[PDB]
DNA sequence: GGTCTAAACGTCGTATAGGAGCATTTG
DNA sequence: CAAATGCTCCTATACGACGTTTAGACC
């Protein structure tokens, strides 16, 4: 069974957080407002979303082009209020979270049946995610977007958030360079990598400091990178052994550590070794069938 | 000078995020 | 009826993941 922590830690990485406003004729305000929480993500990680399902006992799964689960009726977000009020976002999303949980209140008590609470509506869906389109902003055109949390000063809840980020937003693989100067041919690394968007510096350079190793890299995204071979293996690969990763990339993982175990027996700077490990590789992440 | 590790630097493709609205059920 | 929400379809970028070059430790 999941932990709830790493639900949050991957609620973090992949969820979105939405209220749609759309025109409609048969509403009294000629308006139609609804909250929706919803996680997307690639067909081959249906499972992931069951285990989310089984644990808080709500939410409608769907796989066609992609797999999701939703919720979306009054009584599937209170699950999803209820979850996150006792296991907190630590991300920007927090503060959507926020936007979105007022809304949800309003919608619950029909406050949003007014013309006063729908127009209260139209604040918070302006200042969450991507704003308002140009149509909404024609049809509301007085629209102050409600105030935003910053999110700031967040530590790390505990080691199961780590563990859901990282299956969300986390990189488990094998580098390899051409570079003559070895004699092989090439040199083999074994890189540790978590993504993410500026706006959250802040919490990157806490998990540095977390999980006591990495660099930080600014391409804007900012990269945590491990690449400090007995950080991985003293440090990362403890951590996710204990805090397991969820979905396909625990089998990437799997196979990340078995590279990493070559590395450290050296068999990288051997041809027959070198062949081996690249067989790994081209059967992790992008290359795994 | 040779061999090697670490990581700074580069960068592509899509699985994530985010979106909107018609159809159906309900009381 | 109209409100709620089931269901389905649309868009595209912050992610993941793959590749090369540089600084320099160690012998
Ligand atoms: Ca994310
Ligand atoms: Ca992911
Ligand atoms: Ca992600």
Known sequence: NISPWTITGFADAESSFMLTVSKDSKRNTGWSVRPRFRIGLHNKDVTILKSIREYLGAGIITSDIDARIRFESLKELEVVINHFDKYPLITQKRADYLLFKKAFYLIKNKEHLTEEGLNQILTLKAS??????????????????????????????????????????????????????????????????????????????????????????????????????????????????????????????????????????????????????????????????
């Open 128 to 289: 969450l995610n991507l704003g308002l389109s140009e149509e909404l902003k024609e049809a509301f055109p007085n629209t102050i977007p409600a105030e935003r949390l910053l999110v700031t000063g967040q530590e790390i809840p505990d080691s199961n958030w780590v563990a859901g980020f990282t299956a969300g937003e986390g990189s488990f693989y094998i580098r390899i360079a051409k570079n003559s100067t070895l004699k092989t041919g090439y040199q083999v690394q074994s890189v540790f990598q978590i993504t993410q968007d500026t706006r959250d510096i802040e919490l990157m350079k806490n998990l540095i400091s977390y999980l006591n190793c990495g660099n930080i890299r600014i391409r804007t995204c900012v990269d945590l990178v491990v690449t400090n071979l007995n950080d991985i293996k003293e440090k990362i690969i403890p951590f996710f052994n204990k805090n397991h990763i969820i979905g396909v990339k625990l089998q990437d993982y799997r196979d990340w550590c078995k590279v990493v175990t070559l590395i450290d027996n050296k068999e990288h700077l051997t041809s027959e070794g070198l062949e081996k490990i690249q067989k790994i590789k081209e059967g992790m992440n992008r290359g795994r069938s």
